[PDB]
Write a protein that binds this ligand. Structure first.
Ligand SMILES: C[C@H]1CCCN1Cc1nc2ccc(NC(=O)c3ccc4c(cnn4C4CC4)c3)cc2[nH]1
Length: 144
């Protein structure tokens, strides 16, 4: 009778391409990973920050974006599994969500990578304050 759910959508994705020639350091690939909303949505209303956990080999592997764009642009030798934490402007649980992102590169001779992973987040009975943020972001209220 006082229940609701608010669904919001996140898009995680990455692009990778084999450099025409490797960098001095022998980096073979450029890549970019991101978190975004669908078009006409503003996820910054409910996202405090996004944390991208790069392979321990990278300088400052804990890459924090506190405002859009939520992305990391890098060059590298190899794909890896990237924890991505999306922190919410929520005073209560859940305070964040963690994704395990498959940052895979294109093997020599394959076209560039351009992947998207769509994530629907369902908040059950958010606080008044957090519900407001989710809706401002373009979130959809479902009643029972
Ligand atoms: C454009 C600039 C901005 C700041 C730094 N950046 C250049 C840059 N510095 C870098 C420093 C390190 C790396 N490391 C990798 O690309 C990498 C290394 C080892 C990996 C994997 C996957 N698995 N494994 C282990 C062996 C099994 C990936 C890439 C770097 N790119």
């Amino acid at each position: 009778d006082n229940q609701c759910t608010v669904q919001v959508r996140l898009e995680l994705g990455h692009r990778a391409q084999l450099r025409k020639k490797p960098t001095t350091e022998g980096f073979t690939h450029d890549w970019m990973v991101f978190v975004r909303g669908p078009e006409q949505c503003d996820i910054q209303h409910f996202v405090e920050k996004v944390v991208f956990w790069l392979h321990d080999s990278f300088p400052k592997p804990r890459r924090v974006c506190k405002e859009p764009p939520y992305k990391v642009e890098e060059s590298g030798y190899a794909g890896f599994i990237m924890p991505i934490e999306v922190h919410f402007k929520n005073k209560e649980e859940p305070r964040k969500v963690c994704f395990t992102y498959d940052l895979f590169l294109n093997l020599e001779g394959n076209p560039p990578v351009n992947h998207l992973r769509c994530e629907k987040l369902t908040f059950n009975n958010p606080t008044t304050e957090f519900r407001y943020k989710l809706l401002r972001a373009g979130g959809v209220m479902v009643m029972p």
